[PDB]
Design a binder for this molecule. Structure first.
Ligand SMILES: *C(=O)CCCC[C@@H]1SC[C@@H]2NC(=O)N[C@@H]21
Ligand code: NA
Length: 1130
């Protein structure tokens, strides 16, 4: 009673997965076959064995009989089961199996030929006494044949709900069909099947006139069918099992088989398609996949799956079994409601609407219905995207700064919340942030809208519309928001908010990390965003709280009028003379700063006076005197990346390697969200208390929404002079209890710094113990404590505990920390593949040479700099990377759990420096060395300042699908160990793809780091260690420190042409990178002409219409103002 020992599936997707469940249950070994895009699919995983066919297309792989038959040969499969599609109804193939001693689980090549031609099929039907055609339904009969003249009708299905002939919903039993006519569909089907000596499963389709009560032969499908599961629900038969048993001549005894149909059952087909744009296939990575577990769902997808446009966009078949038609229709609606699939556009909403219709319920179904079905998405549609339009929410992705997950959310949080409030949204509603110029949107449903923020002209069906007022939108309406004239950004709110899944607590988009928002990115031409109409929705979005209302005008923020701004900050952490000269601190607050073309949500870069440093270098943390033992920064901090500063904003870095001078006050950050290149700013010192006042005034303004409650910067709010950021110093007491320095670090945090400016492993354990002391006292008011190398940043809620109070608890819990030199900690050991100096790492330096700084003591090659400043061979550097034991000291250096690690061997600690200024771009998985520290850049496209050395795999698993035992996206924890092992660039790209699909087995072992054992290891090597240390710096390192400190050059300061040229202008201000085309090249419409760097992005300015490149205006290094002429095409 085992038909076959091993069976191959000549198929992919959902049918392959379903055939395999049966095979498994039957104890039959299964064999997968896959194309190249399918190498990661469920059916390949589920099988006992598998054979790569090589190639991409249907024809190259699944359809190539030769390959298939070789595949079954190679694995010793006694049988091939084909599914449907592909070689399923291909008779040469059925015949090849036969002529090869492989049993084709299907009918004979002859029967397939006899049924393939529209007219041979008609004769058989006639001879079989099947009524033929001498508002149409589609009723089909599922039949089984034993290949020896016996045939049995298993039931009928209605498949009327078809769109341009493609089935979407099927059901059984057929509704509104009398027994007289069902029993005679059955018997006709059995005659047809008998006459053929039909073998295995086939379907006889009929046309049915419901009114006339008549049916007519349409065709036989000589195979199993996609909708077969509804039949299985009502009979309890496993049709694949039957096929297998029949195909091996161990058929069920047909004359004695009693089939009972029990209840009613319905199936909906979930496709990766867009119903709003013509059912156009929608490829991409599924980001979250949830199905009702109580329905039967035949699928091949889960969180993680990459859905391609190649084969057929089926995702899942959702199958429900009810007591009767009405029970099943309700079940199906619940199932559809409970189906959450995100990452691709689906037809779920289209399905929901159909499953829900009065039509479907009254059973007024016909092969024609779906072709004139009124489908309206409760949603908008992007007719044009705008330069950078993102779904955001507020406060954003909070909870995870210690990991280096930024909050994201709106860059100007005040306007954002006004916009929300104006429409009466709960404050958690998501909205769109428009940057520089907005989208044009088509609304498919009705709602209220508002726009707030910068000055932008806004259109509804072409009539100007007011900002800060609730505008009523109709359906067919086109809202359009143009260029931002004053400020950078505006906010478009929609009553009820926008419907997008949360990631890590928030619907905010973090584009760098492909996280959150509308599928991890800015909006695109063609996107379709869903709203939350309470009557037409099943949504978890928070319902509005308030009736809409124009914002009182006294509550509007005062944007600058003339590209010039005063911006309030709290002094600290590092605006003190241990780091900067006195006069430089004065100049910092006295002079104006100009906003630099490289500014974006990661941070806003500034041009102004160059620093005078109090130290000659930064020692072990890097030579440049701004370099600091990596510590966690504050939102709003003004970070000195070498000799130039940048304001850390809501998509910004967290654990970082440079000093911060001051921090924009929480409530002042909105200003920074409205800066545009060329703006001037001046930082204005502000006391902790004043900073709280502004903030609280914004909350009251938003909460009550009442004239006069907004406070803003004014002279009597401003400190006379910058103050000292050092809040208190505890003196050093003993070896394990170092000095403690408490620095004010923003409106929201106190930075605690241990020791002298120096690394010491004990201090890392100590930070762990401080954190533990706060948990033990369960202190009220503390928001998040973030570990750095020798510091921890403590975020508080000023409405729960004030600055002074938190300082004193901290000073006090500090004396409660007790531990000895012999401590231990759980430590995970990661062994990670790394390519030395591969192409993507080197190209990162190249881009830095050609876009920012082309000469520097650490250029042209970073490894050579490490080698040279340390007096070793480059291969000595390579050797240490592959023998060092890197202990993670903190996360988010920089972004998504990017580690800051330090070799456990002191002889592995090399002098170095961090870039001056930092890069704007780094490749995912790049490994860096910053002074003596090591990092892995977990995110693609991140600013970075470490010396680049090679590349591993990201230690951030966004969807937690990797093959490892870690339960969240950040794979590392402080005190873990990373070791590198050598692979080739190409071997690394294999691993990278494999790991992105969860098919790479990360080498991780749980263990324990023991400081007692470690201190003993230092002893048996103390000699070598000391020799190494005494001989490290010198005059050579000092010349380097001198050279490293030279500020980069100031950017550059910024005739007749043929009569009907295309003149080409850059939209943005940026520095000219490189040309794309050569003068005299032919270009098409769209083709690139030149490249700019603007806003940390590689900006292609391209040809409008086709032509020849007549002139290209700039060379590498030129500044280009927005609206400047950049090329001419003739
Ligand atoms: C735009 O370039 C914003 C950059 C913010 C500062 C960058 S992030 C990585 C470097 N490390 C660091 O501590 N600051 C630099
Ligand atoms: Na605050």
């Amino acid at each position: 009673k085992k038909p076959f020992e091993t069976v191959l599936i000549a198929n992919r997707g959902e049918i392959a997965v379903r055939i395999m469940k049966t095979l498994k249950r039957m104890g039959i070994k299964s064999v997968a076959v896959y194309s190249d895009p399918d190498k990661y699919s469920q059916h390949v995983t589920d099988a006992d064995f598998s054979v790569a066919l090589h190639g991409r297309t249907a024809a190259e792989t699944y359809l190539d009989i030769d390959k298939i038959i070789n595949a079954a040969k190679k694995t010793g499969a006694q049988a091939i089961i084909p599914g449907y599609g592909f070689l399923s109804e291909n008779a040469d193939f059925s015949d090849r199996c036969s002529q090869e001693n492989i049993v084709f689980v299907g009918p004979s090549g002859d029967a397939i030929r006899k049924l393939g031609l529209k007219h041979s099929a008609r004769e058989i039907a006639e001879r079989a006494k099947v009524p033929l055609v001498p508002n149409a339904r589609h009723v089909e009969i599922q039949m089984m044949g034993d290949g020896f003249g016996k045939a049995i009708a298993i039931g009928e299905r209605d498949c009327s709900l078809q769109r341009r002939n493609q089935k979407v919903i099927e059901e059984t039993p057929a509704p509104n069909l009398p027994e007289a006519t069902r029993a005679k569909m059955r018997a006709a089907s059995e005659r047809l099947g008998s006459l053929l000596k039909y073998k295995c499963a086939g379907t006889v389709e009929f046309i049915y006139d419901e009114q006339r009560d008549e049916f007519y032969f349409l065709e036989v499908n000589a195979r199993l069918q996609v909708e077969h599961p509804i039949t299985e629900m009502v009979t309890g038969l496993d049709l694949v099992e039957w096929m297998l048993r029949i195909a091996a001549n161990d058929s069920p005894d047909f004359d004695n088989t009693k089939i009972e149909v029990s209840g009613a059952s319905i199936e909906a087909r979930l496709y990766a398609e867009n119903p709003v744009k013509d059912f156009r296939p929608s490829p991409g990575q599924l980001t979250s996949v949830s199905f009702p577990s109580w329905a039967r769902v035949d699928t091949w997808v889960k969180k993680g799956t990459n859905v391609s446009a190649e084969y057929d966009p089926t995702l899942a078949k959702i199958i429900v079994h009810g007591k009767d038609r009405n029970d099943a229709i309700m079940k199906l609606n619940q199932a559809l409601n409970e189906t959450a699939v995100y990452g691709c556009i689906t037809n779920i909403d289209y399905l929901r609407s159909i499953a829900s219709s009065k039509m479907f319920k009254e059973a007024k179904v016909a092969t024609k219905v779906l072709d004139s079905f009124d489908y309206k998405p409760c949603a908008f549609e992007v007719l044009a995207p705008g330069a950078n339009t993102s779904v955001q929410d507020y406060p954003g992705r909070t909870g995870y700064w210690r990991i280096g997950v930024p909050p994201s959310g709106p860059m100007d949080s005040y306007s954002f919340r006004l916009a929300n409030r104006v429409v009466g949204n709960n404050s958690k509603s998501p909205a769109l942030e428009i940057t520089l110029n907005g989208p044009k949107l088509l609304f498919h449903t009705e709602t209220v809208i508002a726009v707030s923020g910068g000055t932008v002209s806004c259109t509804l069906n072409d009539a100007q519309i007011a900002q800060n007022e609730p505008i009523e939108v109709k359906r067919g309406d086109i809202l359009s928001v143009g260029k931002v004239t004053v400020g950078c950004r505006a906010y478009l709110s929609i009553r009820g908010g926008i419907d997008v899944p949360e990631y890590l607590g928030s619907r905010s988009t973090f584009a760098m990390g492909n996280m959150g928002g509308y599928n991890g990115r800015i909006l695109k031409l063609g996107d379709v965003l869903f709203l939350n109409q309470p009557e037409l929705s099943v949504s978890s979005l928070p319902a509005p709280d308030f009736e809409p209302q124009a914002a009182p005008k006294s509550l509007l923020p005062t944007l600058s009028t003339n590209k010039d701004w005063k911006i309030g900050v709290t002094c600290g952490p590092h605006g003190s003379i241990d780091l900067f000269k006195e006069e430089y601190i004065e100049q910092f607050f006295n002079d104006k700063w100009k906003v630099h073309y490289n500014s974006n949500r990661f941070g806003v870069r500034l041009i102004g006076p160059k620093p005078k440093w109090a130290r000659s270098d930064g020692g072990e943390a890097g030579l440049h005197p701004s370099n600091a033992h990596d510590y966690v920064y504050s939102l709003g901090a003004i970070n000195f990346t070498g000799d130039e500063p940048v304001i850390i904003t809501c998509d910004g870095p967290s654990l970082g390697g440079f000093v911060c001078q001051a921090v924009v006050a929480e409530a002042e950050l909105w200003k920074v969200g409205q800066l545009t290149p060329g703006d001037t700013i001046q930082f204005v010192p502000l006391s902790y208390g004043v900073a709280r006042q502004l903030k609280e005034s914004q909350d009251k303004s938003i909460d009550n929404f009442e004239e006069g409650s907004l406070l803003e910067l004014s002279d009597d709010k401003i400190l006379p002079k910058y103050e000292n950021p050092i809040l208190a110093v505890l003196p050093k007491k003993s070896d394990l209890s170092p000095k403690v320095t408490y620095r004010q670090a923003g409106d929201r945090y106190i930075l605690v710094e241990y020791g002298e400016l120096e690394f010491d492993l004990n201090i890392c354990y100590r930070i762990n113990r401080l954190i533990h002391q706060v948990e033990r006292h369960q202190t009220v008011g503390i928001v998040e404590m973030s570990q750095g190398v020798r510091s921890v940043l403590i975020e508080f809620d000023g409405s729960k505990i004030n600055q002074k109070a938190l300082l004193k608890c901290l000073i006090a819990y500090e004396s409660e920390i007790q531990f000895d030199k012999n401590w231990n900690v759980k430590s995970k050991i990661f062994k990670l593949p790394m390519a030395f100096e591969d192409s993507k790492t080197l190209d990162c330096v190249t881009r830095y040479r050609e876009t920012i700084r082309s000469e520097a003591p650490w250029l042209p090659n970073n490894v050579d700099f490490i080698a040279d400043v340390n007096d070793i061979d480059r291969n000595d550097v390579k050797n240490m990377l592959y023998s060092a034991k890197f202990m993670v000291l903190g996360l988010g250096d920089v972004f998504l759990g990017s580690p800051c690690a330090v070799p456990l061997d002191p002889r592995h600690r090399y002098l170095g420096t961090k870039y001056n200024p930092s890069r704007t771009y780094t490749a995912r998985g790049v490994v860096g060395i910053g002074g003596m520290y090591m990092c892995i850049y977990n995110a693609e496209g991140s600013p970075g300042g470490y010396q680049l050395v090679g590349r591993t795999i990201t230690a951030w698993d966004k969807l937690v699908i990797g093959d490892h035992p870690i339960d969240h996206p950040w794979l590392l924890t402080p005190f873990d160990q990373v070791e590198f092992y050598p692979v080739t660039e190409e071997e690394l790209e294999v691993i990278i793809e494999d790991n992105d699909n969860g098919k790479f087995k990360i080498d991780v072992e749980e263990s324990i780091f023991d400081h007692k054992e470690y201190l003993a290891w230092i002893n048996e090597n103390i000699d070598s260690i000391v020799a190494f240390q005494e001989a490290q710096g010198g005059e050579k390192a000092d010349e380097f420190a001198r050279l490293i400190q030279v500020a980069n050059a100031e950017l550059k300061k910024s005739e007749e042409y043929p009569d009907d040229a295309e003149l080409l202008y850059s939209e943005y201000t940026g520095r000219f990178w490189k040309p794309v085309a050569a003068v005299g090249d032919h270009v098409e419409a769209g083709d690139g002409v030149i490249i700019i760097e603007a806003m940390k992005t590689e900006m292609v300015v391209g040809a409008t219409k086709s032509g020849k490149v007549y002139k290209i205006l700039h060379k590498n290094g030129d500044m280009v103002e927005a609206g400047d002429l950049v090329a001419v095409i003739v």
